[PDB]
Paper text:
SidN (Lpg1083) is one of the L. pneumophila T4SS effectors and does not exhibit sequence homology with any functionally annotated proteins. SidN, a hypothetical protein with unknown functions, is translocated into host cells in a Dot/Icm-dependent manner. Our results show that SidN is a nucleus-localized effector, and its structure adopts a novel fold. When ectopically expressed in mammalian cells, SidN is transported by Importin-13 into the nucleus, where it attaches to Lamin-B2 and interferes with structural integrity of the nuclear envelope architecture, leading to nuclear membrane disruption and eventually cell death.
In order to obtain clues about its function, we determined the crystal structure of SidN at 2.1 Å resolution by using the single-wavelength anomalous diffraction method. The SidN molecule forms a nearly cylindrical shape with a length of ∼60 Å and a diameter of ∼35 Å. The architecture folds into two domains. The smaller N-terminal paw-like domain (SidN1–82) is exclusively α-helical and formed by four helices (α1–α4). The larger C-terminal domain (SidN83–227) is composed of six α-helices (α5–α10), one 310 helix (η1), and a four-stranded anti-parallel β-sheet spatially arranged in the order β1/β2/β4/β3 from left to right when facing the sheet. Three anti-parallel helices (α5, α10, and α8) are packed against the β-sheet and the rest helices (α6, α7, α9, and η1). The two domains are connected by a very short loop. The C-terminal domain contacts the paw-like domain via the N-terminus of α6, as well as the loop between β2 and α6. However, the surface of SidN has a hydrophobic concave region lined with conserved residues on the end of the paw-like domain, suggesting that this region may serve as a binding hub. A single-amino acid change of phenylalanine (Phe19) or mutation of both phenylalanine (Phe19) and valine (Val40) in the center of the region to charged polar residues significantly decreased the punctate distribution of SidN at the ER and nuclear envelope, indicating that this conserved hydrophobic patch in the paw-like domain of SidN is essential for subcellular localization.
Residue numbers in the entry:
A (entry chain A), B (entry chain A): 1 to 225
Write the structure that this text describes.
Amino acid sequence: MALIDQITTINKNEFTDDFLRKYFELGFGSLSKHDIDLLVYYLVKEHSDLFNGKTNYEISSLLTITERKLQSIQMESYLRYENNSISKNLEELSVKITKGEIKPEVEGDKIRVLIDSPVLRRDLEYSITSLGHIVDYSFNKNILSLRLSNFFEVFGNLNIENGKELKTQVIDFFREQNKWDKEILIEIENKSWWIKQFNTLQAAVKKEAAALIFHSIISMVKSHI
Amino acid sequence: MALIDQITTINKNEFTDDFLRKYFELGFGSLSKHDIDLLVYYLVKEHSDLFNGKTNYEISSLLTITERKLQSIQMESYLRYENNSISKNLEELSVKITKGEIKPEVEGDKIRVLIDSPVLRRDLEYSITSLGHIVDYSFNKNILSLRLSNFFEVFGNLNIENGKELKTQVIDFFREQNKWDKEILIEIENKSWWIKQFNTLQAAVKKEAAALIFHSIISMVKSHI
């Protein structure tokens, strides 16, 4: 079975102990098939490394189910059997960016972020839309697209975790890169600035700018509940 | 949970390994609730001592299910996941009699045997009714009642495992006990013999006679496929 030996490590004692406690909570035969499928997904995720570092495409292939079914299973099981703060999920998103597992990229006046985890996607969307203002964004499958000019105009004044204003931290990045790149004016609330001036920069400056921008946006959202 | 700590020993490694192999045989989410309930029953029975030495009443109480449901689950799970010969099940029945876990008792012209296991009950009934003749017997719940006079008249000539005829082995028992009990004629194919003469014996002779008779009947049935 390509499945059970793809498991390279698993705490079999607590897989068994946990399964028995939850299968038998209301008595033998009390859980529905769907309840048990959520339990099994949780048990493999909590007590093995099977899903570790794998994309949704890989996990769905491993489980022999569609990506759409996997997303429902992942969310329903997380809600049933796990508890995380929005703060911890936002921080996990941030760390994935620092590690390069998620690579934000700017195109025109939009920053785009592939977020494969439905749990992280849910908490980001909820938290970023709970700041008192409608947010200019959309999702293309699992890719968040966020309008830059409008975001900084509307939310640029809110503090990030290190106390500085969001717009301040992003502007300060562009100044430093002006030290080794050809100098540009900095107008982050300007749609045409992103479209023409930002587009001029070297692909590696733009890559790094997008990671810092999204790090700072997450940091701003974490600072505000 | 009165359940999971009633487990005094369990191979948790193979409980986990076995569950994963069978849960995932056709892919995640392919097994019905009923399929999974049969699997779990088999897994607890194969990989723990939870059910060991317990009556159906105790197991059903442990599982929070009726005795009728338990019997269906036990049979369906055995058929799905286990394999035993009729010969091995008949021998297990025999050993339970020697151990005193099952105590055959004669009343009138009938010998009665409580058989709690639906698996053993099924193989006994099938094997004992596959000897070419209709058998005079009935079940009261899990108590087999077998008519003595008619059984020895019809099947008394068939060999038991040690080569002797069934009627011969049973008669030889009554002779030995005549050595220390008051002597009786021996007419095991006679209904009124069981009802009046056998009834005379001491309760401990009758207890031992019933175990030897049923041991020999099982031995006869094992000798004939």
